[PDB]
Amino acid sequence: NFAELKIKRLRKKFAQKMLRKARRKLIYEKAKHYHKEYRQMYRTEIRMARMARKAGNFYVPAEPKLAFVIRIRGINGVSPKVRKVLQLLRLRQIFNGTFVKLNKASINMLRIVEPYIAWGYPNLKSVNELIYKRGYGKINKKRIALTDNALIARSLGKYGIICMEDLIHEIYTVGKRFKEANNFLWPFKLSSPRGGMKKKTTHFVEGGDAGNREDQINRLIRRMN
Amino acid sequence: KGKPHCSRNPVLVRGIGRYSRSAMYSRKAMYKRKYSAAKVLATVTKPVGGDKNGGTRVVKLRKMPRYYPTEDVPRKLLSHGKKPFSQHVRKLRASITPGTILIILTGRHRGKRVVFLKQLASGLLLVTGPLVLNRVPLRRTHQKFVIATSTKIDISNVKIPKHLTDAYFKKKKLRKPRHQEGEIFDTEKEKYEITEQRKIDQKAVDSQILPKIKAIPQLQGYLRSVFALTNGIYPHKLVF
Amino acid sequence: AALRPLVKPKIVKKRTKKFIRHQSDRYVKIKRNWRKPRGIDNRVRRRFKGQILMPNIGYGSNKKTKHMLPSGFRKFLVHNVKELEVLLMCNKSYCAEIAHNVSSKNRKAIVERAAQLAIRVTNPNARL
Amino acid sequence: GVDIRHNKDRKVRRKEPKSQDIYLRLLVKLYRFLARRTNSTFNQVVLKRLFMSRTNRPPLSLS
Amino acid sequence: SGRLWSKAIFAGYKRGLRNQREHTALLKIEGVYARDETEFYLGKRCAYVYKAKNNTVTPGGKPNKTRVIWGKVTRAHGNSGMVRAKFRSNLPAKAIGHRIRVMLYPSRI
Amino acid sequence: MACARPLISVYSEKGESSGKNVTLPAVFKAPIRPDIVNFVHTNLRKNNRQPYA
Amino acid sequence: SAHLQWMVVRNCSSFLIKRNKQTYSTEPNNLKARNSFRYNGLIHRKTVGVEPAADGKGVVVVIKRRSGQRKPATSYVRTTINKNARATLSSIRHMIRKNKYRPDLRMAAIRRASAILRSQKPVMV
RNA sequence: GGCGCUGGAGCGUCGGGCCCAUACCCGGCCGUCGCCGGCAGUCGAGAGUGGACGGGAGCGGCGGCCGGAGCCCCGCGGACGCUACGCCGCGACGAGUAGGAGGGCCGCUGCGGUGAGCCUUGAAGCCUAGGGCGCGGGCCCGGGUGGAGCCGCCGCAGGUGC
Numbered sequence A: 001n002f003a004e005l006k007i008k009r010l011r012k013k014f015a016q017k018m019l020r021k022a023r024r025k026l027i028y029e030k031a032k033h034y035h036k037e038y039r040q041m042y043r044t045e046i047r048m049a050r051m052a053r054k055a056g057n058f059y060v061p062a063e064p065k066l067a068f069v070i071r072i073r074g075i076n077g078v079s080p081k082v083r084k085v086l087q088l089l090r091l092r093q094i095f096n097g098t099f100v101k102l103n104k105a106s107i108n109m110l111r112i113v114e115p116y117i118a119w120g121y122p123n124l125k126s127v128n129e130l131i132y133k134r135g136y137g138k139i140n141k142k143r144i145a146l147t148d149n150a151l152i153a154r155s156l157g158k159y160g161i162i163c164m165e166d167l168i169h170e171i172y173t174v175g176k177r178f179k180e181a182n183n184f185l186w187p188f189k190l191s192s193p194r195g196g197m198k199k200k201t202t203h204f205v206e207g208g209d210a211g212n213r214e215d216q217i218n219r220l221i222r223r224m225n
Numbered sequence B: 001k002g003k004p005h006c007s008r009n010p011v012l013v014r015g016i017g018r019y020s021r022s023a024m025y026s027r028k029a030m031y032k033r034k035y036s037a038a039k040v041l042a043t044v045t046k047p048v049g050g051d052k053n054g055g056t057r058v059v060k061l062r063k064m065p066r067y068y069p070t071e072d073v074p075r076k077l078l079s080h081g082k083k084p085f086s087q088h089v090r091k092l093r094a095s096i097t098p099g100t101i102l103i104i105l106t107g108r109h110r111g112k113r114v115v116f117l118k119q120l121a122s123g124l125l126l127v128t129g130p131l132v133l134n135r136v137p138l139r140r141t142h143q144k145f146v147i148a149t150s151t152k153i154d155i156s157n158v159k160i161p162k163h164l165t166d167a168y169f170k171k172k173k174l175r176k177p178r179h180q181e182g183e184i185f186d187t188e189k190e191k192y193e194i195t196e197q198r199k200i201d202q203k204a205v206d207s208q209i210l211p212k213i214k215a216i217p218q219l220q221g222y223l224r225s226v227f228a229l230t231n232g233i234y235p236h237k238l239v240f
Numbered sequence C: 001a002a003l004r005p006l007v008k009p010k011i012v013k014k015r016t017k018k019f020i021r022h023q024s025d026r027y028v029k030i031k032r033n034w035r036k037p038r039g040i041d042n043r044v045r046r047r048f049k050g051q052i053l054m055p056n057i058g059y060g061s062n063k064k065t066k067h068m069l070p071s072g073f074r075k076f077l078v079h080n081v082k083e084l085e086v087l088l089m090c091n092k093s094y095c096a097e098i099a100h101n102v103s104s105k106n107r108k109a110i111v112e113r114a115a116q117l118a119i120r121v122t123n124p125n126a127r128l
Numbered sequence D: 001g002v003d004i005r006h007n008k009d010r011k012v013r014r015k016e017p018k019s020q021d022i023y024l025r026l027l028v029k030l031y032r033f034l035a036r037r038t039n040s041t042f043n044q045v046v047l048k049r050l051f052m053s054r055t056n057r058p059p060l061s062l063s
Numbered sequence E: 001s002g003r004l005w006s007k008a009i010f011a012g013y014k015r016g017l018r019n020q021r022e023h024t025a026l027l028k029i030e031g032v033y034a035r036d037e038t039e040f041y042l043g044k045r046c047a048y049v050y051k052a053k054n055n056t057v058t059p060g061g062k063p064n065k066t067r068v069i070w071g072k073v074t075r076a077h078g079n080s081g082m083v084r085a086k087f088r089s090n091l092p093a094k095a096i097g098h099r100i101r102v103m104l105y106p107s108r109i
Numbered sequence F: 001m002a003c004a005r006p007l008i009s010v011y012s013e014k015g016e017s018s019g020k021n022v023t024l025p026a027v028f029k030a031p032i033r034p035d036i037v038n039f040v041h042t043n044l045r046k047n048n049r050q051p052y053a
Numbered sequence G: 001s002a003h004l005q006w007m008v009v010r011n012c013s014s015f016l017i018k019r020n021k022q023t024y025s026t027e028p029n030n031l032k033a034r035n036s037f038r039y040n041g042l043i044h045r046k047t048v049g050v051e052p053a054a055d056g057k058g059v060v061v062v063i064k065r066r067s068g069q070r071k072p073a074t075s076y077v078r079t080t081i082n083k084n085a086r087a088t089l090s091s092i093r094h095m096i097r098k099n100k101y102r103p104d105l106r107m108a109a110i111r112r113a114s115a116i117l118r119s120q121k122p123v124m125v
Numbered sequence H: 001g002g003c004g005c006u007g008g009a010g011c012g013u014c015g016g017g018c019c020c021a022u023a024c025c026c027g028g029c030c031g032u033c034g035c036c037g038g039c040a041g042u043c044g045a046g047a048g049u050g051g052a053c054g055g056g057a058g059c060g061g062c063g064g065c066c067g068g069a070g071c072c073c074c075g076c077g078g079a080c081g082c083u084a085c086g087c088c089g090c091g092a093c094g095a096g097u098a099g100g101a102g103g104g105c106c107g108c109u110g111c112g113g114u115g116a117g118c119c120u121u122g123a124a125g126c127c128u129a130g131g132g133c134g135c136g137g138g139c140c141c142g143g144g145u146g147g148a149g150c151c152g153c154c155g156c157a158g159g160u161g162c
């Protein structure tokens, strides 16, 4: 039965290799399609603004639906409500970052913890840098580095997210399974901001760092990780 | 079997080929090169000889160990890199081109100005600030421990001998065979001897380097002089 | 010359000095053996800067090199010849010390047997 | 510093029998192996009951 | 035949006001009074050369009184041409205000 | 093992077997319980003690 | 049974030595002389041990027979091997592997025999 | 805060650099906690996300259209392991009075066992710019003095640590 069992193991290994090849091709084509979608959205915003300006009107862009929140103050002397909301945002340490889906409830929570955080609207590059350099998964309650696509697939494949690109797409374009994809990510442990901060104790619009800076959160992220 | 071909995928950036997967498929013509279907003797038999010793003997090579140590060390994991020194790529600073005047920073020839000829297989430079000028023979040196000046001579179309290699310039030693405990001093041979082959090579190289040095004024005086730091001058403000 | 251990890793000591007891320098009645300070105002206990350091578990040695002698072996105490053959199979990692109260004629035999068994002794010439 | 609380980190539960009964320890070894190498939750329940104390293992009447 | 090393002064250790990190030293190289001029000296070997009572072996020579603590420049310090140096052993405090030689050895030019 | 009781030969005063065999008593297959033996030994070694004060 | 006797003597034994954060067992048939269930030379139905010969040459390989488990006088069979080192190691390898007599002690016995033979050979100068 | 500072080392509004906390990031080591995680498969033939058979009818690559049995052996061989109260992996975490708990191959004294233990070829004790081990409690070894007793391990019991 030796020849037959050799044939069995060769057939099993070959089927496994073909399955891996098919999945890799699928991942490649999904990433290509995501690239097409990203450039379509980026050009669409410009085109809409251009036609409004040609007509002499104003094109108001959609209010951003994704935010990046970074806790900037430490854990000493925190009021109970601010402490609770920071725990619900999973910011239990200074220079911890989390993606937040923006709506009325989340925005009001951000207003509650406004002095303790700096938040803004990340762009595609910021999402890519954050997921690729500091992306860790919460797999079996453990902080596991996203070194393989199988780690994402085994935890989120039931939602259709099977690769780094799928995770980045779901985070960037806030999809149906954004809650699952975001909670799968361990909160980002960012370094100290290289080059320093302006003033962590005051709001951004008064020369400090706390509060909502609209899109300067990308500059903060570049210096931060 | 067939003749090996060139890569057919030019490298534009390290790790990335110029052509895609389908492009390289068409370039390789994989559409028609499709295939579907179609040791060492451990023991040796030797005639032992002698009457009624049986026919022969099946003598195995690599007999089992006579002794086993009380405990061993587990084997290492695999590193997918870490090439030996002989296989390392050799990098040369862009300021060091053949014919450049270099300044030695270490050794007995400290501060002397020599002429660069070629990088060797180990990356060590081969220099000869000609022996008639500053007593520096054909000698190896390290590019990390030299300063490449701006003055150069055109040492193209001169013949560096082929045998001038790392094995040629490698140091030789005498000690210590046939001697274990030192009760009689083995300090003999400590006087290094300049080989006649080395003298011939030095003469051959210098006879064709010197006329090009004399071709520009007082470069021979420059090479005879040694480099030094005056109290007013600072190496970061100096153009070499 | 000397017998060599199986492996000789670099032994890293987090601290090389001793943890002396607080105020053991000011009194002869206070030995240098470490005692945890439990005074209400004790600045050493409170860990003020520039004070005597207190031992804690962070100073623990690497488990691979713990109890290793500078030679790379680990010490085992033997009282007679019979307790020496337990190291016959631990030859390349454990070395024997003859106990301090073993007589000269007995430790001579212990040393000879250890030389036979290739077992290292850290005090081979100790009563002669 | 991290804003967490450490008072509930250590879960209080039996990881082994407090008894020194060697027969009990042998059959705890057996059911440790079975609970590890099988998916039967029955083996897990039996192992955790073997860990338990006498008051947590009350006698069962024939009736 | 020549000095062949740049003069520097051991200014002190890396420190705050009330904390001192002796594992790294601050060097003042002569003639270097701006941060942008310090790039040449990064990575250069530096030596604290001193004399003692007992003779020690000299590489390529007879034993003498000279001893060296070797080190190298790691990065620029401040804006005024200070550099930081790491030595094999932490520099003795008696060397503050004394000579350090920057040896040019790992040349990048 | 527990239900199996072998035959032990009775040895004569000269050290060799006398040909007589005794079935192993069932007490030699009883549970071996060092914890209970230690407990009983600990508590009974106190009973021969003589008071001091 | 071996496991029950191990639970009895794993910490209470006259052969047990606990010193210098180490532990050792000095029972006669213990290869590696370590306190362990696998290497204990008393609790197992079949055991193998290697000892130096009475004269300082060769080894004695002792194995436990199957029948007389409760009869210690005839429970052990001892053979003396006084061949060269390679032949001795081959003999021990064949006694353990070919007989399938505790194959998990094969390299322990081979290493112990090598140690004994190396100790027996005359010292150098 | 001192020296001092007045084209500022003062006051107001601002920029770029730079300095360093036990804070943040990366890495090493220690411990705790968690995964009630893995290992009885020591299974160099084990081979496992089904195999078995047993006859239907069929192709596919080799044995000129009929065709078929495989068993290791030119080597007889193959590291370590698993005190399972053991060993191994991964992740997070580490302030602490009063107080609580665990571990102690930390220490003292005596008892039952055990070490075919140590010792007048020198015990206990003591001294020591001697060599070390442990985070630590402490311990081992060398040298001296001393002159008759002492210790390890498994349990037991305290008039047990300044």
Ligand SMILES: [Mg+2]
Pocket: A076, A077
């Ligand atoms: Mg505060």
Ligand SMILES: [Mg+2]
Pocket: none
């Ligand atoms: Mg900087």
Ligand SMILES: [Mg+2]
Pocket: none
């Ligand atoms: Mg405040």
Ligand SMILES: [Mg+2]
Pocket: C015, C016, C017, C018
């Ligand atoms: Mg220490």
Ligand SMILES: [Mg+2]
Pocket: C023, C024, C025, C026, C027, C028, C029, C030, C031, C032
């Ligand atoms: Mg004192």
Ligand SMILES: [Mg+2]
Pocket: C040, C041
């Ligand atoms: Mg107080």
Ligand SMILES: [Mg+2]
Pocket: D001, D002, H094
């Ligand atoms: Mg912490």
Ligand SMILES: [Mg+2]
Pocket: D006
């Ligand atoms: Mg706490």
Ligand SMILES: [Mg+2]
Pocket: none
């Ligand atoms: Mg604590």
Ligand SMILES: [Mg+2]
Pocket: H159
């Ligand atoms: Mg009392």
